[PDB]
Amino acid sequence: VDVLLGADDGSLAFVPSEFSVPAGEKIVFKNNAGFPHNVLFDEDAVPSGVDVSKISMSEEDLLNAKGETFEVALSDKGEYTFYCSPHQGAGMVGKVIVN
Ligand SMILES: [Cu+2]
């Protein structure tokens, strides 16, 4: 599943912001507009057993160009919150449900 970083109108959103996926399906975060963006998972809002460092960019690493991707595959079922580090305080957060 593809998830855009930034809407075509400049909004600071993941697109889609919430979606469900089967366990192990690859999620392709694709840089879109309104840079910079990145993707990290919230250690406080993932299923128990999940290590967010394995599925997160380094906070220092930013995507500044259209078409750069960050790809992950989540194997543990449950709810995960992801966020954009620069844009977390502007509400660029999302939730994926792995089922
Ligand atoms: Cu962002």
From Swiss-Prot:
CC annotations in GO: chloroplast thylakoid lumen; chloroplast thylakoid membrane
Localization per Swiss-Prot or TrEMBL: Plastid, Chloroplast thylakoid membrane
Protein name, UniProt field: Plastocyanin B, chloroplastic
Keyword Thylakoid found: yes
Cofactors: Cu(2+)
Family per similarity comment: Belongs to the plastocyanin family.
Keywords: Chloroplast, Copper, Electron transport, Membrane, Metal-binding, Plastid, Thylakoid, Transit peptide, Transport
Binding, Cu cation: H37, C84, H87, M92
Keyword Iron applies: no
Bilayer topology annotation: Peripheral membrane protein
Domain Plastocyanin-like as annotated: residue spans: 1-99
Gene Ontology MF terms: copper ion binding; electron transporter, transferring electrons from cytochrome b6/f complex of photosystem II activity
Function recorded in the entry: Participates in electron transfer between P700 and the cytochrome b6-f complex in photosystem I.
Co-factor binding details: The crystal structure with reduced Cu(1+) has also been determined.
Chain ranges passing through the membrane: none
